[model samples]
Target: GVFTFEDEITSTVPPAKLYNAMKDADSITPKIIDDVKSVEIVEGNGGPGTIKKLTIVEDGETKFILHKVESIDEANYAYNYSVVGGVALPPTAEKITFETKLVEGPNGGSIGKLTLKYHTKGDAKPDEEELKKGKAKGEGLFRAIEGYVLANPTQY
Candidate 1:
């Protein structure tokens, strides 16, 4: 089974600032989220084709994740990535693709949009609870980053 999920968030930050922070998430993510210990560039130039490793904290426990960037367009302020292997995904998930874009908001802030496609094995459709969990995680990530940037006005 394959399905898609989409959501958008409005932010008070500038689009360029948000885009830059998202593009260089490897450096900013850990700082923004306490659960994110760090992100390492396992291969490539941290752009498309790059494989990165993430060390994360969950319930006071440590976990590792591996993901490959599918596409990244610096000029477009958008990028796509897939979860190759990690504690974040289940074995039934054959392929999970994520796309994010930053654009100017009508409120003169910024709009962060997210789109996800989930491909599972056989007819193993993802459960509603599972989808909710995935959405929650994604939302949490965006909020954490946004909160950080807002808190440190000059740091984006």
Candidate 2:
């Protein structure tokens, strides 16, 4: 089954700032997210075809995820990526692809649009609760990044 979800989140951060921060997430993510210990580029340069591996710890247990970059449109502030491997995915899901864009919003803020597609095993509908949890986690990550930028003022 293929399950798709789309949502938008508004932020006080500017579109360019948000997009720049996201582009530099490799260095900043661990600083903001406690569960994330580190992020490493195992393959390719930091570009469209790069592969990023995230080391995370939960409940004193270690886990990791492999994220493959698909495309990045700097002018449009759009990025596409996919989770190819890791314990982060649910057993029912074969893979998860993500498309995100930051567009200018009211009052110099930005609105981030996210589309998530989950390719799951036959007849399996992604759990609603799990989806909600995933959304919450993403929101948290956005907020964490937002707070960091706001605090630094001059940094992206």
Candidate 3:
């Protein structure tokens, strides 16, 4: 089965500024978030088809993930990617898709919106508990990144 979800994080930064920072996430995320150890490109260039290995620091240890870029629209600050391989994914998951877009917020700031689509393995659907946990995890990433950008006005 397939499950879909979305969330938005509002930032005081402008759309272009926030978007550019997010576009270059691999370079900035680790620097901003103490929990992030590093992000390296494993294959392809910086654009679509590129595979990135993301390492998240936790309890003095690191967790890894392999993500394949599906698409990127620089002009609109939008991108799509799939978690092709990762320790973070549950065994029941076949694949997980993330579509992220930046937009001008109602208050003139920026809105980082994310849409997630989860595909389970085989004919079995993903567990409801797992979906909620994943949603919270994804939302935390957005908030942390936005908070980082907000704190460093001159950076993003």
Candidate with best TM-score: 2
Q: Rank candidates by TM-score, best first.
A: 2, 1, 3
* Model 1: per-residue Cα lDDT over 1-156, one tens digit each: 889989987888877877776676777788878888998889999778999999998898989988899987767678788877886568788767777888888877988788878888888887777688777877776677677777777876
lDDT of 3 by residue, 1-156 (tens): 788888877777778876676677777678777887888899999889999998887788778888888898977788778888875578889778887788888877877778888888778876888777667766666666677778777775
Reference-based TM-score, model 2? 0.90
Q: After superposition, how far is residue 48 of candidate 2 from its true place, in Å?
A: 1.6
Off by over 4 Å in 1: none
lDDT of 2 by residue, 16-132 (tens): 888877777787789989998999999999889899999999899999989998889988898777788886478887877777788899999999988787778889988787677
Model 1 poorest ten-residue lDDT run: 137-146
Clashes of 2: 0
Instruction: Name the candidate that leads on lDDT.
Output: 2
Task: Give Cα-based local distance difference scores for all models.
Answer: 0.80, 0.82, 0.78
- Report per-prediction Cα RMSD to one decimal: 1.7, 1.6, 2.0
Between the candidate structures 1 and 3, which one is better when assessed by TM-score?
1
